[PDB]
Structure formats: C-alpha cells, structure tokens
C-alpha cells in the first residue's frame, strides 16, 4: 500500500524560564526514526530506529544543523506572533508544524502537505496544489505576504516532490525488513458476566503493525454500532499496536455475536465467535 | 548628547555581527544602550578613558530596531544624559530582491534630473533606497498594484556626481526587516 514520511515540530514559550522548548520528530509510516530535544544532553539529532543508524556523520551533521536553525526560526516566530496578536510576555504560547509526503505502492508521489498552528489552531497551511497558502486570520495574512516574497511555497513544493520522496524511498529500501513487514494481530476473546441476565464480550487485537485496523461487532450479521464500546488504538511500547471492542449481551445469546477484524497484514478478514 | 554609530554599518545581513559604538567628548562613567519597540532591552557597559562597544549578536529579526544610547554619572542617582540620535539597525536578506532602474537612464548630463524606481511582484508596503557613501536611506511607500507590480519612485533632482544605489523592500508591520539587495545600479554623470 501507500507509505509516508512526516516530520513534527513543537516550540513552547516558557516566559522567564529560559528560551523555548523545542521538540522535533520524524516518522516513516507509523514508525519513529529520528528525534531532537532542545532540553536533551547531546544537542544532536538522534536515531530512533536501527535502519537509520547506517547513515554516516555527514548525515547527522546536516540534520543537527538544519533542525537547530529551525528551532531558532521558531524561537523568533514566537516573538513575532506575540506582537501580531498584542499578547503579553508573561504567558506561554505554542507553535506546531507538520509536513511530509506520501507515495503510492508504485512509488509515485501521491501528495504532500504543510500546515502550521499557533496555540492549537490553524495558523497557515499550504493548499493542495502546493503553489499558495491559506491563512486562517489577519495575522497569518501578514505571514502569507512575507512567505510569497520569500518563495516559501516553491521551496516546500520542491522539497515535497523531491528529497522527501527520494529519502522516503531510500529509507523504505534500507529498512524494508521492518518497514515493509506484514504484522497481523494476534486475536482472542474474553467473556465476563456482568449480572445474571447479561455478560460483556470483548474482542482483542494485539501485536499488530501498522496501526490502521477495524474492529466491528455484528449480531445475526447486522452491525451493532450504538451499543459497542471501543478504545482508541494505542501503542504497545515495542513498535506494535493494540485495540479492543466490547459489547454487552444477554446471557447466553453469545453465539449470535461476531467480531470482525480487518487489517492489511491479514490474508482475509477474521470472524471471531464465542 | 552622546554619538551612536554602527560598525561596519547599520544594515546587517542575516546571522552576521555588528558593533554599536557609543562615543562622547566629555567623560562619562557609564553607558546604556536601549532598544525600543516590541523587543525592548537595555545593555549596560562601563567603557574606558571615553567610549563603549556594544556587540549585537548573530543578527536575527528580534535584534533589529531603533537604538538610543545614554550616559550617566554615577549610579545613584542615575543622572541620565540626553538620548543620542536614534540609530535604526536593520536586518537584510529575508525576501526576493526588487528591481532598480533609472529614468531617463542611469547615465545623465550634469544638472539633469534623475529618478530611480524600485519594483517587485511581491507586495512590499515600502521601499528603501541606499547610496554607497551615505549612512541613511531614502524611503517611500509603494503604490497600489499596477500591472501586477508594486513600485516606488525616488526622484533625486539634478545630478552632480555619481552614485551606486541599491534598493530594498519591506512590510508595514516589520519595518526593520528588509528584502535582499537589488542589483547595485551605477548612476554616471557624463
């Protein structure tokens, strides 16, 4: 299927308590592979997957340098946005930046994007044609004209269609053993009485990768949307994902209920039945 | 009233360093450098004999702005002198350079008038024309969009001697943050 590369930046102003907190991370699909933390000790961009450790010192020097430049830009942009909105120097404020690209299974560019936020709200975003920006408000309109004048759009677009795609594909090849792994869920079911007219039936999905998964309960072949509790998919800590789905049923109509599990690592969708 | 000037000059390229020297014929024991605007700050320095040398760190847009230098003697009471002439320190190189052109042409007979015009596709609110041997720039607002360009004229009057001129654009809400230099233009008097 598709693959993606994504970078995430966060800068948080810490009035009085030194200069802002900067954190940058990079993902290929649902796997983290690099990070930078301004509070960390090394002051280097650091590896977080084994397949990227094969890059040499010149790589780590460039990545370190560029991210630190990014942190400075973010630092000063905190000052600029504080002025735009006439905010006091006493409060903490936050800039978030997400960008990256997707390739299809044929390895062709499918899209790219860049969006920025201030204090948790859309600030400015790159339109889907990659040639212009959408500003959320008057302050961001000032940023828009600066960015048109700085040719920011052209440089993001060049990046998104060029090295983003090239490096994503490089990485997928270097790390194909893990990144291209089909890792299907181990499944099992649990069953607990709640009273003497009802019981809970919980369908479990563990150890799966990637995180995209669908868990549905049926009853006599009809969906049970309203009465089903399900949790947000969650990391297991080891690079894998978990999710469950539960339904309260009358005793003992258990046989009428069916859990359906769809995941790309499964040859075909499972049906589980107690 | 102290003297306050920039070395090598008040137009500082991104990431470079500049020295704001404070100078006075009468001895002062103390120097204060105040930046005004949105990033207000005061640097303190003692000096020598009498003068002081304030170093303004790798240039970024939060270091741009108007500086004034004071003097006093001594600490309590802070008998603050008159403020020096303002000194605007500007960061350049942040956006696409505008075009610069001469009318009737960049070469002219002595006493004929000359008009330099700054142009860009980008929506600058104002232009800044600097001449090689002068410390201040002439400035002037951009017109409205005409044939997709934003433009300002600097009529210079009758020509005496040459000039190498350069032109910079900027935006209203950040008047000390200027685009790249236009290609330098040489004005000759035949």
């Amino acid at each position: 299927g598709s693959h993606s590369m994504r970078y995430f930046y966060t800068s948080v102003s810490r009035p009085g308590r030194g200069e802002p907190r900067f954190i940058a991370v990079g993902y290929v699909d649902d796997t983290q592979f690099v990070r930078f933390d301004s509070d960390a000790a090394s002051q280097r961009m650091e590896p977080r997957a084994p397949w990227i450790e094969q890059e040499g010192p010149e790589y780590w020097d460039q990545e370190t340098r560029n991210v630190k430049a990014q942190s400075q830009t973010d630092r000063v942009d905190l000052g600029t946005l504080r002025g735009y909105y006439n905010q006091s120097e006493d409060g903490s404020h936050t800039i978030q930046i997400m960008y990256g690209c997707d390739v299809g299974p044929d390895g062709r560019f499918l899209r790219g994007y860049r969006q920025d936020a201030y204090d948790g709200k859309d600030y400015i975003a790159l339109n889907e044609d990659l040639r212009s920006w959408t500003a959320a408000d008057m302050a961001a309109q000032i940023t828009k004209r600066k960015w048109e004048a700085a040719h920011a759009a052209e440089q993001q677009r060049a990046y998104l269609e060029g090295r983003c795609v090239e490096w994503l594909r490089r990485y997928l090849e270097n790390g194909k053993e893990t990144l291209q792994r089909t890792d299907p869920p181990k499944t099992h079911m649990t069953h607990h009485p709640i009273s003497d007219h009802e019981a809970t039936l919980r369908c479990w999905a563990l150890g799966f990768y990637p995180a995209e998964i669908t868990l549905t309960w049926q009853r006599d072949g009809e969906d049970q949307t309203q009465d089903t509790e399900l949790v947000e998919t969650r990391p297991a800590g080891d690079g894998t994902f978990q999710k469950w789905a539960a339904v309260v049923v009358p005793s003992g109509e258990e046989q009428r209920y069916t859990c359906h599990v769809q995941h790309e690592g499964l040859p075909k969708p499972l049906t589980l039945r107690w | 009233k102290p003297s306050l000037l920039a070395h090598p000059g008040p137009l500082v390229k991104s990431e470079e360093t500049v020295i704001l020297q404070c100078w006075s014929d009468v001895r002062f024991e103390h120097f204060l450098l105040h930046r005004e605007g949105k990033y207000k700050d005061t640097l303190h320095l003692i000096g020598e004999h009498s003068k002081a040398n304030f170093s303004i760190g790798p240039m970024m847009q939060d270091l741009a702005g108007t500086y004034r230098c004071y003097g006093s003697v001594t600490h309590s009471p802070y008998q603050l002198s008159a403020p020096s002439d303002p000194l605007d320190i500007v960061i350049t190189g942040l956006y696409e350079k505008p075009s610069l052109s001469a009318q009737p042409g960049p070469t002219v007979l002595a006493g004929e008038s000359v008009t330099l015009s700054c142009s860009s596709r980008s929506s600058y609110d104002m232009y800044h024309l600097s001449r090689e041997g002068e410390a201040h720039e002439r400035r002037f607002s951009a017109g409205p969009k005409v044939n997709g360009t934003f433009q300002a004229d600097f009529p210079l009057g009758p020509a005496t001697h040459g000039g190498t001129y350069r032109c910079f654009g900027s935006f209203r809400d950040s008047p000390y943050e200027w685009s790249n230099s236009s290609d330098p233009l040489l004005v000759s008097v035949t």
């Binding site: 560029n66 830009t73 600066k146 | -």
Partner: peptide
C-alpha cells in the same frame, strides 16, 4: 531527511 528551507512568519 528534513527540510533545509525556512522563513520568518
């Protein structure tokens, strides 16, 4: 690889 291009807001 992250982006090298960046611009004040």
């Amino acid at each position: 690889m992250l982006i090298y291009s960046m611009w004040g807001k």
